[PDB]
């Protein structure tokens, strides 16, 4: 009864794991990435977040009403996290050829990490909601 949930048709789960993987990709290849490629890894993280927000949006009407507002808040937290990452990416671009380059990239990594952690929190929230839905039914 404490076994992992069946993820076969679980779109939210798929998109959360894709987002975490995209963050891992950014983290892995940021050190060797040329300045013009900063927008590419960040847009890709953002693209995966867009799908996650979409998949949660579709699910929300079928989750218990008491679950929806906290899940909505976590969606807005992910948006705030992405805004922060974009900000750090811009700073990294502005300071490509200055002595602030390494610090800006360090802050990009930190912002991207926070986004992935908050994505996992959304997954937990959605999983809880689905369990509580099965209780009401």
């Amino acid at each position: 009864h404490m076994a992992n949930l069946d993820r076969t048709d679980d779109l939210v789960y798929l998109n959360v794991m894709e987002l975490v993987r995209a963050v891992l990709e950014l983290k892995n290849e940021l050190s060797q990435l040329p300045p013009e490629g900063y927008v590419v890894v960040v847009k890709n993280v953002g693209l995966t977040l867009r799908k996650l927000i979409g998949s949660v949006d579709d699910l929300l009407p079928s989750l218990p009403s008491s679950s929806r507002t906290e899940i909505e808040g976590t969606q807005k937290l992910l948006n705030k996290d992405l805004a922060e990452l974009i900000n750090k990416m811009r700073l990294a671009q502005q300071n490509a050829v200055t002595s602030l380059s390494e610090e800006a990239k360090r802050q990009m990594l930190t912002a991207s990490h926070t986004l992935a952690v908050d994505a996992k929190n959304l997954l937990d929230a959605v999983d809880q909601a689905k369990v509580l839905a099965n209780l009401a039914h």
Partner: peptide
């Protein structure tokens, strides 16, 4: 369109 989705599309617009 939900508020979260609109807010995000505004962010992705700043990248494109």
């Amino acid at each position: 369109k939900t508020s979260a989705a609109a807010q995000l599309d505004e962010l992705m617009a700043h990248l494109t």
